[PDB]
């Protein structure tokens, strides 16, 4: 019973030392292809098991860290989860202030937990193993539970043997003993033990991180070969195609497509299109397309035809950011030899055309450091004066203020608008506009206020009725699996009482269900 003393007990966190003190040949560890070594491997792999789910593959976001704490660290229970004290713990783990926990502060956190208890399940087991290994030698010769130089040498020899080079002249061993002797007591305290384990883990990470990031046994040629045999089997092994494809990053899928094409001179996309059936074909082909390529193809689909798919166009042009939109524009010009803006102008008209065009330019101001309070208030009052206060609506003013301002500024703008208008921004949109413009504005504002909640809503909408709107469900499951899918699951389960996993289960069956569930990631 102690989560209440977990966001606080974490001191001033203060690799050079790792590879400098007792350097191990970079060629030695690169030509490099035991309970404590198993524990270190578990500690290092658990981090990447979550850091690579979304965004930066090497740092944890709040969602990823919450998932990790919940899955791998149920040892502490208390009042289940929280949101203020957990935010405090996330901010105390963030020594860099990048709003993300990287591997170094993750190691700081693990060291702090280990010092605490020094008085799934894998990682808890690794912590118990660290404590047990340290105190088996500490409580031997010399001070009780204080590593004496002799017992330190024994523990370093027959507990972590892999990291010791082939030759360990007594001079280098004593040099390492001295380097470890930070507190200058001639022995080793449990804190020095934890800092040494942190240095080893960070070395292992630098090996993993950067190059040879296939340390997760990722071989693109192996996957290409397995899926080629899965195509070339009786009735097609769709299970293996899914199990593999839908469990690699978009980049890993690019590498696998390249490997397949080099091995068979047939593009993986074409092979799986000619060898796949229906919605599973749609999921897989969307998963093969790179993000920008997928989005550009979806925009084209929504526009290419007699009419227009307002809903999908709206979703994509209102949920994509400036960088995403620039990449999408250029990929569009490549793929279809025409500008996305040109097709947007040719397929829509009026204020809806204006709003779509404006948003698609990806020229929204970037999130600034200063809060422009006077501008927040001026913009809220301008929105009120142009919409609810008057007869009619000044659509150009709304367009300007909602496409050009940043997102946090606009969130403040909306909370201020709530101070002048009795109807909030969504309600005011419903009251002042109609049709495609109204739907676009509702989407834009939902994206500006809470994008994971927005996608959780679109998913509930796709799955609540008779059957499914597989197009939308699939596009959200594909496009948000490596971005904010964890927060999407969080909001979905907050609002609708059941996990997105559960609604996927209930609405789709078969291998298509399994592909969607994999892209989901798990329950809740």
Binding residues: 59, 64, 94, 96, 98, 100, 105, 146, 151, 181, 183, 185, 187, 192
Instruction: Name which of residues 298 to 337 contact Ca ion (CB under 5 A).
Output: 305, 307-308
Backbone angles phi, psi at 390, to 5 degrees: -105, 180
8 A C-beta contact, residue 318 and residue 447: yes
Of the ranges 68-76, 145-153, 420-428, 511-519, which one interacts with Ca ion (CB under 5 A)? Answer: 145-153
Instruction: Give the tokens for residue 341.
Output: 């803006």
The correct pick among 4, 91, 96, 174 for binding Ca ion (CB under 5 A) is 96
Nearest-approach distance from CB 469 to Ca ion, in angstroms: 9
Helix 250-264 to helix 220-231 angle (10° resolution) is 70
Contact 68, 60 (CB under 8 A): yes
Nearest residue to 429 (alpha-carbon basis) of 414, 442, 419: 442
Stretch near Ca ion under the rule CB under 5 A, chosen from 24-32, 70-78, 197-205, 342-350? 342-350
Instruction: Figure out which of the listed residues 143, 221, 377, 482 binds Ca ion, where binding follows CB under 5 A.
Output: 143
Structure token pair of residue 463: 């799955």
Instruction: Indicate whether 484 belongs to the interface with Ca ion (CB under 5 A).
Output: no
Q: How many other C-beta atoms can be found within 10 angstroms of the C-beta atom of residue 14? A: 5
Supply the minimum distance, in Å, between the C-beta of residue 392 and Ca ion: 5
Under rule CB under 5 A, how many of the chain's residues touch Ca ion?
A: 27
366 vs 349: CA distance, rounded Å? 28
Answer whether 54's CB lies under 8 Å from 485's CB.
Answer: yes
Pattern of binders to Ca ion over 228-257, x per CB under 5 A?
-------xx---------------------
Among 67, 72, 94, 351, which residue interacts with Ca ion (rule: CB under 5 A)? 94
Among 20, 30, 98, 523, the residue binding Ca ion under the rule CB under 5 A is 98
Structure tokens at 170: 């007594």
Residue among 78 and 305 whose Cβ is closer to Ca ion: 305
Q: What are the beta bridge partners of residue 60? A: 101
Residue whose CB is less far from Ca ion, 364 or 489: 489
Nearest to 244 by CA among 260, 256, 262: 256
Does 422 bind Ca ion (CB under 5 A)? Our answer is no
| Cα(101)–Cα(61) distance, integer angstroms | 7
Q: For 425-459, b where at least 16 C-beta lie within 10 A, e where not — what string?
A: beebbeebbeebbebbbbbbbbbbbebbbbbbbbb
From residue 379 to residue 398, the character string flagging contacts with Ca ion as x (rule: CB under 5 A) and all else as - is: -------------x------
Q: List the interface residues with Ca ion, window 428-447 (CB under 5 A).
A: 432
Instruction: Give me the DSSP letters along 469-495.
Output: -HHHHHHHHHHTTTTTHHHHHHHHHHH
Q: Say if CB 82 and CB 1 are below 8 A apart.
A: no
The footprint of Ca ion on residues 36-75 (CB under 5 A) is 51, 55-56, 61
By CB under 5 A, name the one of 255, 327, 347, 484 that touches Ca ion: 347
CB of 141 to Ca ion, least distance (A): 6
- Mark the segment that binds Ca ion (CB under 5 A) among 4-12, 127-135, 343-351, 475-483: 343-351
174 binds Ca ion (CB under 5 A): no
Annotated binding residues for Ca(2+):
59, 64, 94, 96, 98, 100, 105, 146, 151, 181, 183, 185, 187, 192
Determine the angle formed by the axes of helices 190-208 and 103-116, rounding to 10 degrees.
150
Pick the piece of the chain touching Ca ion (CB under 5 A) from 122-130, 285-293, 346-354, 377-385.
346-354
Sequence-ordered list of residues with C-beta below 8 angstroms from that of 301, at least 6 positions apart, any chain: 309, 312
Our finding on whether 482 is near Ca ion (CB under 5 A) is no
Binding part of the chain for Ca ion, among 10-18, 194-202, 402-410, 424-432 by CB under 5 A, reads 424-432
Q: Using the structure block, give the residue that is written with the tokens 């909602």.
A: 402
Residue number of the CB closest to Ca ion reads: 142
Q: Which is nearer to Ca ion, 125 or 273 (CB)?
A: 273
Evaluate whether 459 touches 501 at the Cβ level (below 8 Å): no
How many C-beta neighbours within 10 Å does residue 312 have? 17
362 contacts Ca ion (rule: CB under 5 A): no
- Smallest gap, in angstroms, from Cβ of residue 390 to Ca ion? 5
* 255/347 with CB nearer Ca ion: 347
The gap from C-alpha 51 to its chain's centroid, in whole angstroms, comes to 6
Nearer to Ca ion, 146 or 381 (CB): 146
One-letter-per-residue 3-state SS of 427-457: HHHHHHCCHHHHHHHHHHHHHHHCHHHHHHH
Q: By CB under 5 A, what part of segment 146-165 binds Ca ion?
A: 146, 148
Q: Which stretch binds Ca ion (CB under 5 A): 69-77, 284-292, 426-434, 451-459?
A: 426-434
Our measurement of the distance from residue 413's CA atom to the centroid of its chain's CA atoms, rounded to an integer in Å, reads: 28
Cβ neighbours for 218, distance < 8 A, ≥ 6 positions apart: 248, 252, 255
Contact between 427 and Ca ion (CB under 5 A)? Answer: no
Residue 280 CB, nearest approach to Ca ion (Å): 10
Helix axes 122-138, 62-72, angle to 10 degrees: 70
Binding site for Ca ion (CB under 5 A): 51, 55-56, 61, 94, 96, 98, 102, 142-143, 146, 148, 181-183, 185, 235-236, 305, 307-308, 347, 392, 432, 463, 468, 507
């Amino acid at each position: 019973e102690t989560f209440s003393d977990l966001w606080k007990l974490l001191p001033e966190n203060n690799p050079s030392q790792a590879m400098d003190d007792l350097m191990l040949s970079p060629d030695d560890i690169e030509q490099w292809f035991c309970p404590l070594e198993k524990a270190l491997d578990v500690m290092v792999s658990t981090f990447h098991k979550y850091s690579g789910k979304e965004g930066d593959k090497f740092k944890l976001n709040k969602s990823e860290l919450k998932e990790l704490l919940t899955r791998e660290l149920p040892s502490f229970l208390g009042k289940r989860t929280d949101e203020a004290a957990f935010q405090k713990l996330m901010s105390n783990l963030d020594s860099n202030r990048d709003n993300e926990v990287d591997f170094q502060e993750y190691c700081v956190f693990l060291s702090c937990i280990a010092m605490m208890c020094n008085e799934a399940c894998p990682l808890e087991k690794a912590l118990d193993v660290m404590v047990s290994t340290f105190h088996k030698y500490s409580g031997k010769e010399g001070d009780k539970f204080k590593l004496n130089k002799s017992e330190l040498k024994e523990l370093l020899t027959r507990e972590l043997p892999s990291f010791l080079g082939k030759r360990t002249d007594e001079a280098a061993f004593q040099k390492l003993m001295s380097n470890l002797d930070s507190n200058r007591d001639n022995e080793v305290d449990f804190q020095e033990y934890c800092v040494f384990l942190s240095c080893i883990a960070m070395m292992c990470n630098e090996f993993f991180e950067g190059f040879t990031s296939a340390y997760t046994n990722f071989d693109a040629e192996r996957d290409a070969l397995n899926i080629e045999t899965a195509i070339k089997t009786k009735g097609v092994d769709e299970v293996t195609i899914v199990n593999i494809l839908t469990n690699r990053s978009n980049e890993q899928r690019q590498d696998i497509a390249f490997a397949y094409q080099r091995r068979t001179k047939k593009e993986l996309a074409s092979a799986l299109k000619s060898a796949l059936s229906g919605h599973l074909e749609t999921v897989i082909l969307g998963l093969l397309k790179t993000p920008a390529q997928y989005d550009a193809s979806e925009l084209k689909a929504s526009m290419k035809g007699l009419g227009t798919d307002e809903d999908s166009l709206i979703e994509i042009i209102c949920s994509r950011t400036n960088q995403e939109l620039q990449e999408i524009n250029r990929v569009y010009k490549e793929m279809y030899k025409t500008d996305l803006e040109k097709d947007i102008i040719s397929d829509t008209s009026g204020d809806f055309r204006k709003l779509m065009v404006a948003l698609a330019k990806g020229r929204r101001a970037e999130d600034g450091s200063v809060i422009d309070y006077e501008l927040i208030d001026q913009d809220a009052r301008d929105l009120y004066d142009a919409g609810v206060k008057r007869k009619g609506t000044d659509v150009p003013k709304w367009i300007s203020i909602m496409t050009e301002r940043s997102v946090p500024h606009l969130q403040k703008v909306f909370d201020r608008y709530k101070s002048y208008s009795p109807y909030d921004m969504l309600e005011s949109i419903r009251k002042e506009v109609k049709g495609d413009l109204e739907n676009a504005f509702l989407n834009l504002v939902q994206c500006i206020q809470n994008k994971p909640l927005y996608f959780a809503d679109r998913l509930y909408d796709s799955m609540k009725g008779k059957g499914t709107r597989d197009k939308v469900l699939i596009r959200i499951m594909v496009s948000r699996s490596e971005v904010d899918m964890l927060k999407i699951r969080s909001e979905f389960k907050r609002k609708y009482g059941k996990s997105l996993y559960y609604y996927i289960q209930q609405d789709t069956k078969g291998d298509y269900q399994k592909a969607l569930l994999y892209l989901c990631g798990g329950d809740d």
